[PDB]
Amino acid sequence: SNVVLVSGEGERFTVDKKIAERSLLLKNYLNDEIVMPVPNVRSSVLQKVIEWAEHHRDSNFPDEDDDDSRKSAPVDSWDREFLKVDQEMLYEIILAANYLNIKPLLDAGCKVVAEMIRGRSPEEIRRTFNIVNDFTPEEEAAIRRENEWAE
Amino acid sequence: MFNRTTQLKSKHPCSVCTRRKVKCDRMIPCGNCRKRGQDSECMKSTKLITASSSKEYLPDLLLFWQNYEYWITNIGLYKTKQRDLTRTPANLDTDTEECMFWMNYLQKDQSFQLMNFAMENLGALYFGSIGDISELYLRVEQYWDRRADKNHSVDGKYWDALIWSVFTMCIYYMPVEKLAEIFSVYPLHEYLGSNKRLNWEDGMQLVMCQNFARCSLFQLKQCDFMAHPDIRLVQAYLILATTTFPYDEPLLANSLLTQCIHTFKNFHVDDFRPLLNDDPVESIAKVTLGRIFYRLCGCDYLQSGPRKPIALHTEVSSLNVDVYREENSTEVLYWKIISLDRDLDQYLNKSSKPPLKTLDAIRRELDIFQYKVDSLEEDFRSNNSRFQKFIALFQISTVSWKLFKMYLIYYDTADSLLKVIHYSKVIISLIVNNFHAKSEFFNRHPMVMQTITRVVSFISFYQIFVESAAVKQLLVDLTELTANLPTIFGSKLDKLVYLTERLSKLKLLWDKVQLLDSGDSFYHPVFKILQNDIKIIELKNDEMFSLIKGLGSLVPLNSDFRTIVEEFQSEYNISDILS
Amino acid sequence: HPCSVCTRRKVKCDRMIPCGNCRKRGQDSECMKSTITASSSKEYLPDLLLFWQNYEYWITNIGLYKTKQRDLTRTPANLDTDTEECMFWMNYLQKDQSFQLMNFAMENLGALYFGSIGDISELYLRVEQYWDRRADKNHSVDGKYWDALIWSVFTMCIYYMPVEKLAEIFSVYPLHEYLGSNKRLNWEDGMQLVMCQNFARCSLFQLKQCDFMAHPDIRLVQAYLILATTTFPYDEPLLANSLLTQCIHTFKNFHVDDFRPLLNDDPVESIAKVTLGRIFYRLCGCDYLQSGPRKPIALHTENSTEVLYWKIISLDRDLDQYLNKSSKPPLKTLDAIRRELDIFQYKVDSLEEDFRSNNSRFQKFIALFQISTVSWKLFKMYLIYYDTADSLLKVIHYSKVIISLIVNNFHAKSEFFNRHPMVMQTITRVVSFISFYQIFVESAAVKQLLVDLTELTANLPTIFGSKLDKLVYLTERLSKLKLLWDKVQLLDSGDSFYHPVFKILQNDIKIIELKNDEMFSLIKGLGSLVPLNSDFRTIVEEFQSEYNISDILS
Ligand SMILES: [Zn+2]
Ligand SMILES: [Zn+2]
Ligand SMILES: [Zn+2]
């Protein structure tokens, strides 16, 4: 009832098989101690994943095709605080949940990413406006003249 | 092959493209602005891309690898039986001495010891085809009374050829030890005059399998099936399609499949649900005919190609279907896991990329097969149980791996290369665990043949350009398992070994020739030779040369990268593996 | 007819249900008084005749010629007479018995080999070399393809050749030694057809000496489109649909798309696009004229005279997509047949023919009978469907135009014009519909046309053989269905007319389509799973048992 996670760092994490069921890649590998490669994700991100599996291994989870329990699913405030982390390493959390097919953790992190992206100030959106290519500068001048009376 | 196709295609055009007044090759920076020497002039808008060392030939290269691995690894290696009509000497009957030797060589213990071995071993295949084996044991018993008769009833001739197809399938999964213990190695090589030192894996096990197929034919030719259509023709053709025969012979099996589909559509029977006023006889007939027709669609799909003019599958597993989903998921599970891959393959030859929404819907229903095969029963000792279990496990893993291959090729989603590496090793480890007794003939269905056909193609092909660590570790087990495939495949096995060799020498060909920049048009022999050989096999598929002989005795009339290209064209030639 | 309240309250000529201005005024069940108890007015003349279409496909076209019965557990295999049906008749047919047959098609049948292979003298290269190839014993697959190609034309040249040439070229007496039949005959009494089928089976076993399905060629389709010129697609419909399906598989394996030449091609290829579009047009003809449930797989996919053949047969494609249908063909659609009748009628009437150039005469006569059958069946589908006046005029008219196409072609080097299956089906439809109309709306000119075609069918020889006789019975029983109508008062429940004729016209289609039900043949394929399946009461049992409708299965 235990499998072994051998990451790109190769830190062998012998976790429970019920932990392994959430990773649907690894739950498929159960049909294939019980080692498997994760050649990209570091094992601290994996340890975050495992601790989430410790927390919500017993939790109940939606049909993952919903709207109400998919898009308007409320977050875990515990896993809000648990994922109040690096912006960068949060993307590695995202890539880990992608790479191991861990969908409710992917959505749970995803919604917190959606929190952090929204609500940003129009000050910086005015500022961080054409960081990427995004517009011809003629249109950039036209936008700045479009609000010219106040901007 | 070659275009620009680099990383981070930008959003808005620069001034140089507006001067340029053509299509916006909105790369970093352009293939056209670099062609005008104004590379940096198209760079100077905002966020000047990144390193100019991302291998920009590689996406074009994988787009043409789609062209290859469609038109070679199914079509070019298997589906071109380019033979002749003049250079093939005639055979008028020629089985009154040949198939009658199998009338001679067949023994009753040699029948029933195959029959009883294949009972729990293969008890899903014929159970998917016909059901009961004891009626078939009864037909082998009456067959020694139905052996050399005079009142050869047409129906009874179908029953006679039925067990030749059954014997074909029994050869197709029996290991060679029990084969030499039940049969005799030598009287075949006596009758052929060939070598006595030919334990059956050395070439003649599958030949005797094809001889049992041929003795099914020799009685089916006497059945007059073109004037006598019936379902057992299609059932035994399912049983023969389980063998390597559709790959070793595409064209004959195409016409036999054509007659089987005409046979089915003679009945004009579509729905498989026992309604209110239905006969229970007709009820069970429809229930059987369901799995019959979906296995028939599976046979339609595996031979599908340019030599397949008449199609059968007209339904979609997602999103003008005929009888789709009004059917109990028992062995149409075996069809639906194939039709899953079917809808993938209307985007292999065509470079039009499918919507990724569809591919992720496919990613959703992938796990439905993954945990509906877990929704079955389980028997450790009934070999058909773990047999069908490993078949469906292999099929969902195969379509999964090919799907992540498609993800990397068409759009390059996150970590999909490592998904390819992972599912490749999982499938190969499943083969390794079935290197055992009772499970060596889990490794004999042509699904593993066509799966390794893709794996040793693309892993070697990505080893060509990216000398990666995991691709090298997988390439070691590739070269090991390529030799360690079962002998039930035979000629295409050796063609696959030559294909592995030619792709390794194609890697060496990339190693010896630097890729020539010509603005953004890149040049290598790897480009042009693979441009040419696919078109060679298409010109073989352009069957005018087999019809130029049909319209009379008519005879028609039709640099650095010209030399080493045309040195590798015959150095490691494709003509070894056309046939 | 306008209904009751249309005649009572005097409203518009309204065959609505019940009316569009009487149901609204509170008279729904009061205005359904429009059409066991009895009735004998012409209310059936709208109420019935469309049921005839159900008869017209499934009994005349399917039931009389195409519906085929076998016996799987009793019929011997081909292990009995493996080569001897092929070898004895290959050893009997000599150089006179090859080329003297071939000179019938060389003089008389110019559109056929141009429709299939192009030239007959190009075929004479192979047939002359066949006497350097009959002696060959280790052929190639190509040479056997040529063998089965020319033995198909050897088959075809048997049938259409009259009996006077045929008794001279072929001797009667050594050949009945093989089968065991009567030597006393001359060939036309269902024996010229039998030796035709014997040579057909010779070419088919040469195809089994080919085993063509391994690597097929255009010799397959060029031989099948020659074999299909006779009633062999009606003598063996199960076999012919199978070989036609093999022609579909083979011809489309060669990836034939364009039918007009292109400039960037091989001239062999660009000329072969027309030189196989002719094969495609005859392939479409065999795809169309074998319209049956036993033929499920279709090929619709959509010089100056071979495409013109498939033009009028595609005008026929606008005709017989309503036989099984209860759908009315629209009057605009039935005029779209008629405005293309205007296209291809005078083009037929501009076709050149010379009584020595019988090649050109049969060249004419194919389209000359196709456009006339278009005329007759077009105004017949006016007449049965819409009950259009001046169409029984056109039925009796174009029936006698076909009488002119037949009676003036029994003569010297013209009787093989009366040996094609198109007249065999068309006169079948004439003697069907005229007998049926004489059952129900009894007129004397229709019975006179019945006597006309009775005399013509007696003039029609027994070269058609066993498929003739069932047609003979078609002339009998239907007229007795007239006598079945004349003896019983027509009954109903007030509107829905009931008759012994009506009950028997049901079981005509029901039992013959039950013979077309191959389900329990598939349960025979399941093997051990056993396949199990007033005057209106008793004279039905009389006329069904006496005039036994299952007698057309031989
Ligand atoms: Zn540009
Ligand atoms: Zn530019
Ligand atoms: Zn009214």
Swiss-Prot record, chain A:
Q: Any keyword Nucleus?
A: yes
What CDD domains does the record tag this protein with?
BTB_POZ_SKP1 (cd18322)
- Cellular component terms per the entry's GO annotation: CBF3 complex; chromosome, telomeric region; cytoplasm; endomembrane system; kinetochore; nucleus; RAVE complex; SCF ubiquitin ligase complex
GO biological process: any one?
Answer: kinetochore assembly
Q: Where in the cell is it found?
A: Cytoplasm; Nucleus; Chromosome, Centromere, Kinetochore
Chain positions covered by the region annotation Interaction with the F-box domain of F-box proteins: 94-151
Q: Which GO terms describe its molecular function?
A: cullin family protein binding; DNA replication origin binding
Residues making up the signal peptide according to the UniProt record:
none
Instruction: Fetch the InterPro entries from UniProt.
Output: SKP1, SKP1-like, SKP1-like_dim_sf, SKP1/BTB/POZ_sf, Skp1_comp_dimer, Skp1_comp_POZ
Q: Which residues carry this modification: Phosphothreonine?
A: T136
Give the protein family: Belongs to the SKP1 family.
What is the role of the protein in this entry? Answer: Essential component of the E3 ubiquitin ligase complex SCF (SKP1-CUL1-F-box protein) ubiquitin ligase complex, which mediates the ubiquitination and subsequent proteasomal degradation of target proteins like phosphorylated SIC1. Participates in the attachment of chromosomes to the spindle. Acts as a regulatory component of the centromere DNA-binding protein complex CBF3, which is essential for chromosome segregation and movement of centromeres along microtubules. CBF3 is required for the recruitment of other kinetochore complexes to CEN DNA.
Subunit text: Component of the E3 ubiquitin ligase complexes SCF with HRT1, some cullins like CDC53, and some F-box proteins like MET30 CDC4 and SAF1. Interacts with CDC53 and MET30 to form the E3 ubiquitin ligase complex SCF(Met30) which also contains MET4. Forms complex SCF(Cdc4) together with CDC4 and CDC53. Component of the CBF3 complex, which is formed of CBF3A/CBF2, CBF3B/CEP3, CBF3C/CTF13 and CBF3D. Component of the RAVE complex composed of RAV1, RAV2 and SKP1/CBF3D. Interacts with RCY1, ROY1, CBF3D and SGT1.
- Kindly provide the name given to this protein in its UniProt entry: Suppressor of kinetochore protein 1
Source species: Saccharomyces cerevisiae (strain ATCC 204508 / S288c)
UniProtKB/Swiss-Prot annotation, chain B:
Q: Which GO terms describe its molecular function?
A: centromeric DNA binding; DNA binding, bending; DNA-binding transcription factor activity, RNA polymerase II-specific; identical protein binding; zinc ion binding
At the top level of its lineage, which domain of life is listed?
A: Eukaryota
Q: Name one GO biological process term.
A: mitotic spindle assembly checkpoint signaling
Q: Which GO terms describe its cellular component?
A: CBF3 complex; kinetochore
Please name the source species: Saccharomyces cerevisiae (strain ATCC 204508 / S288c) (Baker's yeast)
What Gene3D superfamilies has UniProt attached to this entry? Zn(2)-C6 fungal-type DNA-binding domain
Q: Which Pfam families match?
A: Cep3, Zn_clus
Where the protein is mainly located, per its record? nucleus
- Oligomeric state and partners? Component of the CBF3 copmplex, which is formed of CBF3A/CBF2, CBF3B/CEP3, CBF3C/CTF13 and CBF3D.
Protein name as it appears in the record: Centromere DNA-binding protein complex CBF3 subunit B
What is the purpose of this protein?
Acts as a component of the centromere DNA-binding protein complex CBF3, which is essential for chromosome segregation and movement of centromeres along microtubules. CBF3 is required for the recruitment of other kinetochore complexes to CEN DNA. It plays a role in the attachment of chromosomes to the spindle and binds selectively to a highly conserved DNA sequence called CDEIII, found in centromers and in several promoters.
Entry keywords, A to Z: Centromere, Chromosome, DNA-binding, Metal-binding, Nucleus, Phosphoprotein, Zinc
Q: Which residues bind DNA?
A: 14-42
Which residue windows are coiled coil? none
Q: Does the keyword Phosphoprotein apply?
A: yes
**Cellular location(s):** Nucleus; Chromosome, Centromere
Q: Which InterPro entries does the UniProt record give?
A: Cep3_C (IPR031760), Sec_Metabolite_Reg (IPR050613), Zn2-C6_fun-type_DNA-bd_sf (IPR036864), Zn2Cys6_DnaBD (IPR001138)
Q: Further notes on this entry?
A: Present with 1900 molecules/cell in log phase SD medium.
